[PDB]
């Protein structure tokens, strides 16, 4: 089979710079039987190069498609934050038809500390005997962020499952979610429940807690 | 307009059959082939199954022997007829049309395929109200936890989609064989609770369409 190879996961730009997004192919495809497509968030992929260098229609010439036999790139001139996207190549040589794994493509932004907020586990939950606690950290920037869980002042790491959003288009930030979830059993044996964050932004841990002992 | 609607995702058991479908829409169905090409959790696009406008039928080797890709122009519909599934199938699937090479041009929303011999279980939807601090800033921001779910996908909107803006779902996550996802919004402190903020969420395999009401606690 060919193997159709993007070394970088992720490539990060400000806006106005130029990122070269690379392809290998294991085999000659020649010309073109190599196409590039776009996948913004939210959305499933459109066509955006083929033939290696023919933009798509309605795709503007600030992308630029380039190389043939086993070497490509997608160069984006000038990149705007509109072109916050996945980006695959995919030779149509031969069968079976095959795809890079895609390059990420991340609009830098000015630093922005994340907006932080906990929240006890509802009534309904507790009825059932669950206690999930969560905490939303939102609108940050950059993408890299460590949360811990403390209960009355102990660090508390089992029972932590985290999820991250993908950059957002509209405002170039990432948000994350970290639920603890205990048994009521054990969440009613404690009063202070803290969710601490450590980012770029942050000198001494962003702090969000509550006391039970209150509404 | 170009529109590609896929059909039968869903949860089926390892050893199972499912069909998916495809209605197509806004182009002349015959002059175009037709394909399937899934995304799996760990991976990027894996091309499944490709069939000409007419009939010459190219697979896959991962699903060759299991998959029938078959199309019936006089309803311009596109089919994948799936058996011996297995864990590894488990993707979205999307449903894509070329041009006259194989580069597809126009590329379906895409349906969710679980295999997997868990059951289909409704999600528990809590309402996540904050604590008197986190109140009475600017702004102010609730949650809707949604929990132990099987299988994916679940759909959230705030107030029925009005409130879109500030609004974050975050991706499930697989634990105990049951699927969790959890949704904030932000509103101004103005508007909740002097209104209402409610979170609605669909899970379509286990018929399930509830509206959650997010209400401040009582001192």
């Known amino acids: 089979d060919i193997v159709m190879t993007q070394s970088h996961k992720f490539l990060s730009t400000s806006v106005g710079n130029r990122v070269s997004i690379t392809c290998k192919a294991s085999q000659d495809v020649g010309i073109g039987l190599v196409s590039w497509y776009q996948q913004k968030p939210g959305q499933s992929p459109k066509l955006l190069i083929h033939?290696?260098?023919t933009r798509h229609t309605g795709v503007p010439d600030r992308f630029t498609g380039s190389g043939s036999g086993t070497d490509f790139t997608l160069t984006i001139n000038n990149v705007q934050s509109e072109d916050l996207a996945t980006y695959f190549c995919?030779?149509?040589?031969?069968?079976?038809?095959?795809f890079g794994s895609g390059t990420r493509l991340e609009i830098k932004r000015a630093d922005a500390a994340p907006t932080v907020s906990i929240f006890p586990p509802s009534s309904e939950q507790l009825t059932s005997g669950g206690a999930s606690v969560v905490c939303f950290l939102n609108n940050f920037y950059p993408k890299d962020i460590n949360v811990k869980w403390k209960i009355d002042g102990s660090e508390r790491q089992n029972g932590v499952l985290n999820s991250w959003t993908d950059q957002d288009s509209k405002d170039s930030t990432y948000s994350m979610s970290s639920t603890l979830t205990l048994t009521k059993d054990e969440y009613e044996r404690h009063n202070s429940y803290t969710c601490e964050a450590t980012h770029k932004t942050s000198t001494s841990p962003i702090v969000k807690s509550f006391n039970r002992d209150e509404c | 307009e170009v529109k590609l609607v896929e059909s039968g995702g869903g949860l089926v058991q390892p050893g199972g059959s499912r069909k998916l479908s495809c209605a197509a829409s806004?182009?002349?169905?015959?002059?175009?082939?037709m394909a399937w090409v899934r995304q799996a959790p760990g991976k990027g696009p894996e091309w499944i199954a490709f069939i000409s406008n007419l009939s010459r039928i190219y697979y896959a080797d991962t699903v060759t022997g299991r998959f029938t890709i078959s199309r019936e122009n006089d309803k311009n519909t596109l089919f994948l007829e799936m058996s011996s599934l297995r864990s590894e199938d488990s993707a979205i699937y999307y449903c894509?049309?070329?041009?006259?090479?194989?580069?597809?041009?126009?590329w379906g929303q895409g349906a969710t395929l679980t295999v997997s011999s868990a059951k289909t279980t409704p999600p528990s939807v809590y309402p996540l109200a904050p604590g008197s601090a986190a109140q009475t800033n600017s702004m102010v921001t609730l949650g809707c936890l949604v929990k132990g779910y099987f299988p994916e996908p679940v759909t959230v909107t705030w107030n029925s989609g009005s409130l879109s803006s500030g609004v974050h779902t975050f991706p499930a996550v697989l634990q105990s064989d049951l699927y969790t996802l959890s949704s904030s919004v932000t509103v101004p402190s103005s508007t909740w609770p002097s209104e209402t903020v409610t979170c609605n969420v669909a899970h379509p395999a286990s018929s399930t369409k509830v509206d959650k009401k997010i209400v401040p606690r009582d001192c």
């Open positions: 894509t049309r070329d041009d006259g090479y194989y580069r597809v041009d126009y």
């Open positions: 806004g182009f002349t169905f015959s002059d175009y082939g």
């Open positions: 995919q030779q149509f040589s031969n069968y079976p038809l095959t």
């Open positions: 033939w290696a260098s």
